[PDB]
């Protein structure tokens, strides 16, 4: 295909009730739509911060580098425990997981003679 934005996408993703191009041109003119995902699922929260860039020397996250809303027409899904309805995995992501319990091990403390410690390991 060709999004008039320029980006060039796989035809399968055409007339499928999902903005795959970004500009929605891939669904600009469609009569019958082969909907990819038969049921409404949720967006994983902060999914975009796994698609942002990471500046080594600054140790600071920067501008969006991956589009993580792109879904590739595959309706791959993943079920949250402690949250009813399933979440929708994006196409860049091979895996997502939710298993998380807490214990004392998680609450720790350190002593610093001086601030020189923080530089050494990294």
């Amino acid at each position: 295909f060709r999004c008039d934005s320029g980006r060039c996408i796989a035809r399968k993703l055409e007339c499928n009730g999902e903005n795959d191009c970004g500009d929605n041109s891939d669904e600009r003119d469609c009569g019958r739509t082969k909907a990819v995902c038969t049921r409404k699922y949720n967006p994983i929260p902060s999914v975009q911060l796994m698609g942002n860039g990471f500046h080594f020397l600054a140790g600071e996250p920067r501008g969006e580098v991956l589009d993580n809303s792109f879904t590739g027409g595959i309706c791959k899904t993943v079920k949250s425990s402690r949250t009813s309805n399933p979440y929708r995995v994006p196409a860049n992501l091979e895996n997502v997981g939710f298993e998380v319990q807490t214990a004392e091990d998680d609450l720790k403390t350190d002593f610093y003679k001086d601030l020189t410690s923080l530089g050494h390991n990294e």
Binding site: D4, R28, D29, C30, G31, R32, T33
Partner: protein, 872 residues
């Protein structure tokens, strides 16, 4: 709001005076504006720039003729792919990256006639024109190529007026029979190409032409117990065949490139041609079964072969004629939209013109066509529109349809199926289509509507065209703005103010001779959405009348409708202005030797109108699409022009397709001269001793451009006469029987006497005068039996003695040697530089004679040398 527009050809052409329309809705405040064409990745070289001054003076619109000539990279070729349009002005600037072609103009290769015998000279010349349709004087290189795809000779001449006269091309010494090719190109840098073809065959001019007309081009359910075949023979001097004995055979065939076939015995023979005509009805059912076959359905996608032999009953001449084949098919018909742009406007009636064809690519009229339609809404709504019907016109092949779409529409899905009364429902073909709404950020649309199925406009008229702008968020349309293209250069441009009164209003635009072959017009208006102006448009394709700049009119002197076999006569040249003219005389019988057709002119209108960068009936899908599809690309302020999909090649269809008398001089071609015509000229010459129709075509090129005339027929004809059936060549050795008939057209009878004059090397029966008796308005088969001894030797006279007639025939029998024709060749590679490892400067090919040789024959040889050039 200030919105600006620039319009330029989609692609530039080298050496074309490329016109660039500039239109703006600026302040009254007049201003200067430079425009230029600069090189790629560096605006260093500026090949041309144009200082167009606009104002309320020119309703804010100008034209500029920029041009791009030979300033380039010639050696180790890297000829540039791209260039840069630029706008420099007080008020604004921008720039475009635009491609560049070296395709410039038209090369018309004019061979003297389309069929030759070996050892004829092929006369040839060229008509070359530039993108502006003027002379375009460039030295040109045609190159001869044999029917084995092998180059042969090559020759240049300079171009003095547009009528380049090359030296005659004698056909080689033992040449290759088939389809020769002449490829013409400019010695200069422009890419331009021309092709032409001639056949080389041993051929003899054929005395009468046998037509053979079948009832249809398909064979199917209706006509399978009967297929009507009319066969119409007549002479080339306009008098039909009285008595003739006919023989028809039929055969099965796989395809049209099929070299051979399987004959069918029991094939209707022996109908007698009577007075111009004969007829038969071919029962395919009863005949086909004598080979393997049993049903028509068995016989699908197979062709039927017809070959006829008409020998004159009373008139010594075999003639032969054949039909390649007629397809036997279930599916009798093909389908294709003729002048239908696949982009629709909502709240408008859509136009649909469909076309029906037979298996052999020609029209068929009187067939009914059902159109089923389905609409889907912006709403995602799905709706069934009401099925229509029409019947394919007979002059067109086109059935027309109109559906008025509910204005909320986006996508139209239409079916088109044929509904012919005799065909099984499943057999009838269908094609389906989708049409798409012109997208408007505006929600704003346009529909300019003009169509005549009557289909032709005449230079001089004034075009009246209806502009309906239904939908736009605001009708605060200030101005309607049009643009008229023709042969890829913008030629007209202008603006009409919106009538508060109209909603729809007229434009009157004068039809001019700049548009003669064809034209497009495009109309856009700016709707300033008070946040980003939108450009909104539509275009339409307009075939118009075929009128020359210099109409040549040719006339023969003695206005009599039949002519005399020796007589001198003057010819008339006519022109609207000083011109050149290039004459041709062709025996109208010689078109008869090849089933294929003469090709000056028909073509000349078409070739010339293939400089249009457009496609479709016009009318796009964006605003950008519209302008692009129309053969343009713009630079723009409100909506920019995006795409580079010029690449996928254009296809749509626009137009639906003493007191002795001595006869001696029988020239196949003559009048191969060119003349300077000061609007007037005349010239006398005695037309050759030969009973045929002379078909003499004159074509003239001038400042204005090219113009081919109506060909002049001129049948020359005698009352009582003799013509012999002489073979191309005869072999010395075996005795031959020479045929030929005397033709008595006089209302009373006569007693006559033929006698042959033999030359030193040719034999005859006795040695008188063998006085016979021909009835009023008939013929008498006369024959002589000769035997050739001296090879190659020519000249036989035939002398005719009659009541009120005395005729002597000057013919030229040709003779060949017995046995075989062995061919043997050798060669060398000349390699002075020992490239191959050994230096080569000489071979010696020794004369060597094998004693198996047929007596009294030369040994020939030919030296062909082909320089072997290589490399990029």
């Amino acid at each position: 709001e200030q919105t600006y527009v620039i319009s330029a050809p989609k692609i530039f052409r080298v050496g074309a005076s490329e016109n660039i329309v500039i239109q703006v809705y600026g302040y009254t405040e007049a201003f200067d504006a430079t425009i230029s064409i600069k090189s790629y990745p560096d605006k260093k070289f500026s090949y041309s720039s144009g200082h167009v001054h606009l104002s309320s003076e020119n309703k804010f619109q100008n034209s500029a003729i920029l041009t791009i000539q030979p300033k380039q990279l010639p050696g180790g070729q890297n000829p540039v792919s791209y260039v840069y349009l630029e706008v420099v002005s007080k008020h604004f600037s921008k720039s475009k990256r635009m491609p560049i072609t070296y395709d410039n103009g038209f090369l018309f290769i004019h061979t003297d006639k389309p069929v030759y015998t070996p050892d004829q000279s092929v006369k040839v010349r060229v008509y070359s024109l530039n993108d502006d349709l003027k002379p375009a004087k460039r030295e040109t290189v045609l190159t001869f190529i044999d029917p084995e795809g092998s180059e042969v000779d090559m020759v240049e001449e300079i171009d003095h007026i547009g009528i380049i006269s090359f030296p005659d091309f004698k056909i080689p010494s033992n040449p290759r029979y088939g389809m020769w090719t002449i490829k013409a190109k400019y010695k200069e840098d422009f890419s331009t190409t021309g092709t032409a073809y001639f056949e080389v065959k041993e051929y003899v001019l054929p005395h009468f032409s046998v037509s053979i007309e079948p009832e249809y081009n398909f064979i199917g359910y209706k006509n399978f117990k009967n297929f009507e075949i009319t066969i119409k023979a007549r002479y080339f001097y306009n008098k039909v065949v009285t008595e003739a004995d006919v023989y028809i055979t039929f055969g099965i065939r796989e395809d049209l490139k099929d070299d051979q076939k399987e004959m069918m015995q029991t094939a209707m023979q022996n109908t007698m041609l009577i007075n111009g005509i004969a007829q038969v009805t071919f029962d395919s059912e009863t005949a086909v079964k004598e080979l393997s076959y049993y049903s028509l359905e068995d016989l699908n996608n197979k062709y039927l072969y017809i070959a006829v032999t008409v020998i004159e009953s009373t008139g010594g001449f075999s003639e032969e004629a054949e039909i390649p084949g007629i397809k036997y098919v279930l599916s009798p018909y093909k389908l294709n939209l003729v002048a239908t742009p696949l982009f629709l406007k909502p709240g408008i009636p859509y136009p649909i013109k469909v076309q029906v064809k037979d298996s052999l690519d020609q029209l068929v009229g009187g067939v009914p066509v059902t159109l089923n339609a389905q609409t889907i809404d912006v709403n995602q709504e799905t709706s069934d529109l009401d099925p229509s019907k029409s019947v394919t016109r007979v002059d067109d092949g086109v059935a027309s349809f109109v559906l008025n779409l509910p204005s909320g529409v986006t996508v139209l899905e239409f079916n088109v199926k044929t509904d012919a009364p005799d065909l099984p429902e499943e057999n009838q073909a269908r094609e389906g289509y989708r049409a798409i709404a012109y997208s408007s950020l505006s929600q704003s649309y346009l529909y300019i509507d003009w169509t005549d199925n009557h289909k032709a406009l005449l230079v001089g008229e004034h075009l009246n065209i209806i502009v309906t702008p239904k939908s736009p968020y605001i009708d605060k349309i200030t101005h309607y703005n049009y643009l008229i293209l023709s042969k890829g250069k913008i030629i007209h441009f202008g603006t009409r103010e919106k009538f508060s009164d109209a909603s729809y209003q007229s434009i009157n635009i004068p039809v001019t001779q700049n548009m003669v072959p064809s034209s497009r017009l495009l109309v856009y208006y700016i709707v300033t959405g008070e946040q980003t102006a939108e450009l909104v448009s539509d275009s339409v394709w307009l075939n118009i009348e075929e009128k020359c700049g210099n109409q040549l009119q040719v006339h023969l002197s003695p206005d009599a409708d039949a002519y005399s076999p020796g007589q001198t006569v003057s010819l008339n040249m006519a022109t609207g202005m000083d011109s050149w003219v290039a004459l041709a005389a062709v025996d109208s019988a010689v078109y008869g030797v090849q089933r294929g057709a003469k090709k000056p002119l028909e073509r000349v209108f078409q070739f010339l109108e293939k400089s249009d960068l457009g496609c479709g009936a016009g009318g796009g899908l964006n605003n950008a699409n519209v302008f692009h599809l129309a053969g343009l690309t713009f630079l723009t302020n409100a909506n920019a022009d995006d795409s580079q999909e010029n690449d996928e090649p254009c296809k749509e269809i626009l137009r639906p397709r003493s007191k002795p008398e001595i006869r001696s001089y029988f020239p196949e071609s003559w009048l191969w001269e060119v003349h300077l015509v000061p609007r007037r000229k005349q010239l006398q010459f005695a037309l050759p001793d030969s009973l045929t129709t002379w078909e003499i075509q004159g074509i003239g090129i001038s400042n204005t451009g090219i113009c081919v005339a109506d060909t002049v027929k001129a049948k020359v004809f005698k009352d009582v006469f003799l013509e012999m059936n002489i073979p191309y060549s005869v072999v010395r050795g075996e005795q031959i029987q020479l045929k030929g008939t005397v033709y008595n057209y006089r209302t009373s009878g006569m007693q006559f006497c033929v006698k042959m004059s033999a030359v030193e090397g040719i034999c005859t029966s006795e040695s008188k005068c063998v006085r016979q008796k021909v009835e009023g308005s008939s013929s008498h088969l006369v024959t002589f039996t000769v035997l050739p001894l001296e090879i190659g030797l020519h000249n036989i006279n035939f002398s005719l003695e009659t009541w009120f007639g005395k005729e002597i025939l000057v013919k030229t029998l040709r003779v060949v040697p017995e046995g075989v024709k062995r061919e043997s060749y050798s060669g060398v590679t000349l390699d002075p530089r020992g490239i191959y490892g050994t230096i080569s400067r000489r071979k010696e090919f020794p004369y060597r004679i094998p004693l198996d040789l047929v007596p009294k024959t030369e040994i020939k040889r030919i030296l062909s040398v082909k320089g072997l050039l290589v490399g990029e």
